Symmetry: D3
Subunit: 175 residues, 6 copies
């Protein structure tokens, strides 16, 4: 099932990301249930906004906010919910919210899946417009939700992203 | 697995519905197989009709017609086949066909998912139009099938829908 | 799980196909992982081409290329990745590629799902345009992938398709 | 503009149909305004039904119901509203409603646009299932509309369809 | 042409809105060009936001900001760019930006198109959620543009929306 | 009408492209009719291929094949048939077919519509995958159409594209 997908073939450089929410989709926040491994609806978003990239997580990790590391994955076409994509991390958006530090990594499709992203090696290589749209989405998508708040802190590089992956894999194995 | 989802967190007021067919989708009737948990195509509908709401069932229940309780769930955007939604029952369409009594519950998204449906408490709070569209769909969607027949008896209120969930949950323990 | 779907209710005339790629979809090649049962992204296709029918495999078979038998299934509307369809084989497109025989079966929805395909009994009953489109898709969709190539050899009849199903079932059963 | 499209290159065998409503679309009835030539919304349908084929009309015709001849056009993929498709008539569904005799012709794409339909020469050549779904749609799509009623009378052949085209072209030119 | 559509059949209670951007669509801002009547791309939006309702204007009007009156129209399914819908005004969101006063009217489909919106007579009958989503969209959709700024002032009632339509219709006569 | 859209605000650097076929759409080839200005269906393509970018033409130009200059325009989301986009030429794919030279320009959205394409100044700035996909599409999409064929000759730079625009404008102006 989805509960037994590996964190990656070779962490933290070569990872698997379990997709929860397709890029450019309707505003429904899905999450994979840790118990059943099924796709649950978490929320129908109240702002008229959509996740800008496919969104999911790395299995067998535990971040500082209490859940698996969250990852955004840009692709040429949107992926299915519940699919597993091989990726390489290039960057991270740091932000805090009610859950604690809730970082969003960015990882692009591995060169075996496509050579389209081979030229993206670090956070400075992502399009400026994509980075701005991602930050603006996390700054505002919860603006109409009652008990919730976000502060976006800013972008860090691929080395920062990989260290969060190592740390969160270490934390799950112990914890 | 989808076979391991709970009936609900606090039945019968707070339930989980496993979605089989999205609202406003192509006329493919899917059903979750009890053996595998996999989504099986049951039928390509011959009428040019679509389910007016998302359609699914409550896991770990056994209605009078031999299957899990069937539920319609209105949402602001259509859900994925195989996803699980937390809901509150608000009424039931009673109908008979060749499985016997084949009532269709209506449940709305739980207030944790959306504020949109908080003001819907009972069957008289559903829009008249949506009730008429649901009854008309179930009256006509198997018109070009066989020896199927449907007789719609009418709407009952939330207290009756809750009785059907408890009876069918307690029923399935036993069998 | 998808892993425990049967090959068929009555091989070789009545089989189950596990769908990986919907008809007329974006050009993403999904595969079901044999260990986890999850949907993995295999490749983002570089050609501007789409599978002309839903594409999947018969579980618990082992074909001459080392993988379950591959099957195309025409339907009136596209199926979800991960779904299972009951089908009847009508024909096979023999082709070789870069490690070996890699035939593609064609199978139509079973008469219990729809009467639409009842008149298609054999490969001569498939529309000619459809067969030309399938063979053109397989001839060209890996054209931009450097180490890959495809030789299409031609269409054979349902008797040939059914022989392959039984032989491939026995190969998996006995290994 | 759309107001100056010809009825056809060679009536009644070779016609143009102006598409108003795409096949397999949401339940919105559009109509081309005779004054402005713009696409107007005529109705949001209240049943959960969808037109089974692309729907439109032949320009410069005037049927017995007071409007241009209505035509259904099956295609491999849905057409855009406001597009013009070259067709050959193969059949007609006769029905009466509040407007009078309101026949719905069926015409398939001309062989210059595709050879897919070249084998459809008359009403008996259309799939049985398509004809049944078309009749059932016109029998029921107005069931929830207040001041409206339909009686479906039945199918007639291509010669009947072409005579309605000749008659309605004659009636417009005079009237 | 779309340039020849009337402002309305009985202004200001009964109007026509020409639709430019569908509800819940990709973030392409279209506008009808006054010269040609053609649909022109005005902008690819940089935010990951979508218009929460269909968006368009009333033809043959001239508001204080130099353009036709702008109108949001909620519908049960999204409309086509360039289509024309008969509506009734129910309120107005007052806001200023760099065109000056750039109010956005809300109008619902006329009762001849749908019974769904009959019970909405004035601005307090719109769902609170939908009003909040509209205000939040207009507050944030140009966040990543330039020297644009928006200040939302608040909702006024149907009597004020009707005054703005008459003033702008009578205005455009003159100029 | 579409017929009176200008070639450009400042040829050849700043042009308007009238879109006929959206990116990533079903395989229907639309063309704008030069007499009526309507969208006509030209062909249902028999290959399982899609245009890899939006496709259209510059109005009031006359290229060496007797038709307005053809243009592909990459956008972040697909455009509506019949829409007009302001663009800047970056390159041209020279090709011959069965009556003559039939070059295809590539032009990107103008910086007033989006900053995304500002860094694409010339043909060497287009992603290599994209150029390979375009050339592969034009090499193969008429493969099943008996009297048609295509020889791709290669990519030339923006200076070559702009020469063709001006020459083709002068040809239409002077004929
Ligand atoms: Mg969207
Ligand atoms: Mg997460
Ligand atoms: Mg987190
Ligand atoms: Mg059921
Ligand atoms: Mg039941
Ligand atoms: Mg496609
Ligand atoms: Mg194989
Ligand atoms: Mg539909
Ligand atoms: Mg008509
Ligand atoms: Mg009529
Ligand atoms: Mg405006
Ligand atoms: Mg304005
Ligand atoms: Mg040309």
């Amino acid at each position: 099932s989805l509960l037994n997908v590996p964190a990656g073939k070779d962490l933290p450089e070569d990872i698997y990301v379990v997709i929860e929410i397709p890029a450019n989709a309707d505003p429904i926040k899905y999450e994979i249930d840790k118990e059943s491994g099924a796709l649950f609806v978490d929320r129908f978003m109240s702002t008229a906004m959509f996740y800008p990239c496919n969104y999911g997580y790395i299995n067998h990790t535990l971040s500082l906010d209490g859940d698996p590391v969250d990852v955004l994955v840009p692709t040429p076409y949107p992926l299915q919910p519940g699919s597993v994509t091989r990726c390489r991390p290039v960057g991270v958006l740091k932000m805090t919210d009610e859950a604690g530090e809730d970082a969003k990594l960015v990882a692009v499709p591995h060169s075996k899946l496509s050579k389209e992203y081979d030229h993206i090696k670090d956070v400075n290589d992502l399009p400026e417009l994509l980075k701005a749209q991602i930050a603006h989405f996390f700054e505002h998508y919860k603006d109409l939700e009652k008990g919730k708040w976000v502060k976006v802190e800013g972008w860090e590089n691929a080395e920062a992203a990989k260290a969060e992956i190592v740390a969160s894999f270490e934390r799950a194995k112990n914890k």
